[PDB]
Design an enzyme around this catalytic site. Structure first.
Site: not given
Ligand SMILES: O[C@H]1C[C@H]2CC[C@@H](C1)N2Cc1ccccc1
Length: 330
Positions: A199, A35
């Protein structure tokens, strides 16, 4: 040193991926969910409340000649989905894919929430976010990656998740055979303890690319792609009959649909998520309503590049003094 381990989807939907991990001496092999959105290595154990264990493999510290109680230390964690676990702490030898760490904090669960008991395939979590998020008190502990640093050939790990197929976690090296083209690296903020990046924008299907900054985290422990409501509405508007369902808890679409791809930007590079990756199948067995793999992040307070996005790429988690993320197509 290096390590290389295969990671395997737990079910036909790629809901999560499990990776075998050796703990203790002699080895006890547990299948952990790696994770990159948390920082605790915790396991089902001989200490876990018996009614909260249903099929998991347990770690028994009393059977390990290298286990030592980390006296006084406790842990308690709550995840983004409302699940939780807590317990006490041992140090022990932990190996992943041939890479060994001695003195790793192994957080032994005394209690786990229902979502963990009900998933027989996941024996615990191995956190790979920054150690500043580790929950052990009163002495915070390091992740497996942070402890392996310094033995690694290069201070990196890579995630290469499969679509309906096994993939690979590598530690300490880039496999230049595992991706196509070049790796585009992008800046990371560690201010919240995550692999947080920005992004450069998105496209829906064959549509024009929208240049827009989208902060979010690279999180292998989250199944879906969670993005701002504007972006998510723009995607699902291209699927006839798609709608946001308050009853189901997100966007659903007709199972007869063909989904468009979704592209996200990494600097001037582009990662394309095929439409089929965004199908999470019937909302209930036999339903003709299917659950979408792209969902709104509104209310969660962060955008999450989960497995839907990451499994479209070869992803480099660069833990150099100035951390960075890298993405390549594959
Ligand atoms: O009720 C339990 C929790 C979830 C939903 C069904 C099944 C058992 N688990 C699947 C799953 C595992 C990892 C990540 C996402 C989904």
């Amino acid at each position: 040193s290096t390590g290389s381990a295969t990671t395997t989807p737990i079910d036909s939907l790629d809901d999560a991926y499990i990776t075998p991990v050796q703990i203790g001496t002699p080895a006890q092999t547990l299948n952990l969910d790696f994770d990159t959105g948390s920082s605790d290595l915790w396991v089902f154990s001989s200490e876990t409340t018996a009614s909260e264990v249903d099929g998991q493999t347990i770690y028994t510290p009393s059977k390990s000649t290298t286990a030592k109680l980390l006296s006084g230390a406790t842990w308690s964690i709550s995840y983004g989905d409302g699940s939780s676990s807590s317990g006490d702490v041992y140090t022990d030898t932990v190996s992943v894919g041939g890479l060994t760490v001695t003195g790793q904090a192994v957080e032994s669960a005394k209690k786990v929430s229902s979502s963990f008991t009900e998933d027989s395939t996941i024996d615990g979590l191995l956190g790979l976010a920054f150690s500043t998020l580790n929950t052990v008190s009163p002495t915070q502990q390091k992740t497996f990656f942070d402890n392996a640093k310094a033995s690694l050939d290069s201070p990196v790990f890579t995630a290469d998740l499969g679509y309906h197929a096994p993939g690979t976690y590598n530690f300490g090296f880039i496999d230049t055979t595992a991706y196509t083209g070049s790796i585009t690296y992008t800046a990371v903020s560690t201010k919240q303890g995550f692999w947080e990046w920005t992004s450069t924008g998105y496209a829906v299907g064959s549509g024009t690319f929208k240049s827009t900054s989208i902060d979010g985290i690279a999180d292998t422990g989250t199944t879906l792609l969670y993005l701002p409501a504007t972006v998510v509405s723009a995607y699902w508007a291209q699927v006839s009959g798609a709608k946001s369902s308050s009853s189901v808890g997100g966007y659903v679409f007709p199972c007869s649909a063909t989904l468009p791809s979704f592209t996200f930007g990494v600097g001037s590079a582009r990662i394309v998520i095929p439409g089929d990756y965004i199908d999470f199948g019937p909302i209930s067995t036999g339903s003709s309503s299917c659950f979408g793999g792209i969902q709104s992040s509104a209310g969660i307070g962060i955008n999450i590049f989960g497995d839907v996005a990451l499994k479209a790429a070869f992803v480099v988690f660069n833990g150099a003094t100035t951390p960075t993320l890298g993405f390549a197509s594959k």
